[PDB]
Design a protein around this ligand. Structure first.
Ligand code: X4B
Length: 294
C-alpha cells in the first residue's frame, strides 16, 4: 500500500518478493513479504491469522497479514541478517562454539514453543533463521508451509533447497510431525560446526542417498515401517552407517550425542525440542554477542 515506504528489496522469498519497509505512520521498519493464484485460499487466511498470536522471543513476529487484490502481504518484525549470510561471513574462522550453542539452544526453545502449540515449521534452513546484534536468533516463516502445500520453485523459479529435509518427507510420508523440524535443525547445527552443509543434495534422490551414505541406509531395525513408506524402494543401495566422529569433527561427544538424537531416522525416536533442551550439551550454555557487520 501507501502506508509503507519501501526501503529496499530484501529478496525473492520462498513465496514472493520481500521488502524492507517503513510504516510512514509508526515509523516502524518491517519486512514486507508479498505473496502470489485465483484469490488465495481463504483457508490460508484464517490459518495465517492464527500465526499472529504465536509470540515468542525466538520466533520472528508476524505483525500483520493483508489480503488484497489477490495479493497476500505478510508484515514481519525486521532483523538485519540471516544465519546463512552469517555462516558465510564466519566461514574462515567458524562460529565460536559458545555462539553455536547459544543459537541452537534458542532455536530449540523456539521449536519447543511452536511444537507445544501444534505449529510446525516444515522448511527450516539457515536462510530462515534471523539474527540481531543482541545475540538472539529467531525462527522465520514458521507455519506458512502448512498454509500453502509443499515447496518446489519460488517466483523466479529458484531451486528449492532440499538439504534440510527430513528423510520421512523424502520417502513420501504424507503426515509431517514435529520431528521434521528437529531433523532440519540438526542439519543446521552440523553445518554451523563444520562450516559445510551436512547433506547438500541437488535432487530429491541425491538428498536421500547423501543421507543414507552418511547415516546408513535405514532398515526395519532402526526405522520400523521405513520399507512400507510411499517412495521407499527395495532397490535403494545399502550403505553402512559412517562413524559419527567423522561427520562433525571436531565437535565434542556432548554435541555429537545431541546431534545423533536429532538425526535418528525414526521420527518417533528423534529427540523432541523439549528433551533436547535438557541434553548435557547445554550445561554450560551462555548468550554471546555475535560480531555482526551490518
Ligand atoms: N523478518 C525479516 O527481517 C526478514 C524477512 C524476510 N522475508 O520475509 O522473507 C527476509 Cl528474505 C529477510 C529478513 N531479514 C533478513 C535480512 C534483512 C536485510 C537484508 N537481508 C536479509
Amino acid at each position: 500500500m501507501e502506508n509503507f515506504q519501501k526501503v529496499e528489496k530484501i529478496g525473492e522469498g520462498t513465496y514472493g518478493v520481500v521488502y524492507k519497509a517503513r510504516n510512514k505512520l509508526t515509523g516502524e521498519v518491517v519486512a514486507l513479504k508479498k505473496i502470489r493464484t485465483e484469490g488465495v485460499p481463504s483457508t490460508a487466511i484464517r490459518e495465517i491469522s492464527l500465526l499472529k498470536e504465536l509470540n515468542h522471543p525466538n520466533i520472528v513476529k508476524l505483525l500483520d497479514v493483508i489480503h488484497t487484490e489477490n495479493k497476500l502481504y505478510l508484515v514481519f518484525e525486521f532483523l538485519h541478517q540471516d544465519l546463512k549470510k552469517f555462516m558465510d561471513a564466519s566461514a574462515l574462522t567458524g562460529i565460536p562454539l559458545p555462539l553455536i550453542k547459544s543459537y541452537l539452544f534458542q532455536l530449540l526453545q523456539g521449536l519447543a514453543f511452536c511444537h507445544s502449540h501444534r505449529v510446525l515449521h516444515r522448511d527450516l534452513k539457515p536462510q530462515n533463521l534471523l539474527i540481531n546484534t543482541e545475540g538472539a536468533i529467531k525462527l522465520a516463516d514458521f507455519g506458512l508451509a502448512r498454509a500453502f502445500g509443499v515447496p518446489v520453485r519460488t517466483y523466479t523459479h529458484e531451486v528449492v533447497t532440499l538439504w534440510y529435509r527430513a528423510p520421512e518427507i523424502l520417502l513420501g510420508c504424507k503426515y509431517y510431525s514435529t520431528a521434521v523440524d528437529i531433523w532440519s535443525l540438526g542439519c543446521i547445527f552440523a553445518e554451523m560446526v563444520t562450516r559445510r552443509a551436512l547433506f547438500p543434495g541437488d535432487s530429491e534422490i541425491d538428498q536421500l542417498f547423501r543421507i543414507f551414505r552418511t547415516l546408513g541406509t535405514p532398515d526395519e531395525v532402526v526405522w520400523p515401517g521405513v520399507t512400507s513408506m510411499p517412495d521407499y524402494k527395495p532397490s535403494f543401495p545399502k550403505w553402512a552407517r559412517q562413524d559419527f566422529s567423522k561427520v562433525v569433527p571436531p565437535l565434542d561427544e556432548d554435541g555429537r550425542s545431541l546431534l545423533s538424537q536429532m538425526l535418528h531416522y525414526d521420527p518417533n525416536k528423534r529427540i523432541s525440542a523439549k528433551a533436547a533442551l535438557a541434553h548435557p550439551f547445554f550445561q554450560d550454555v551462555t548468550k554471546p554477542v555475535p560480531h555482526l557487520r551490518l
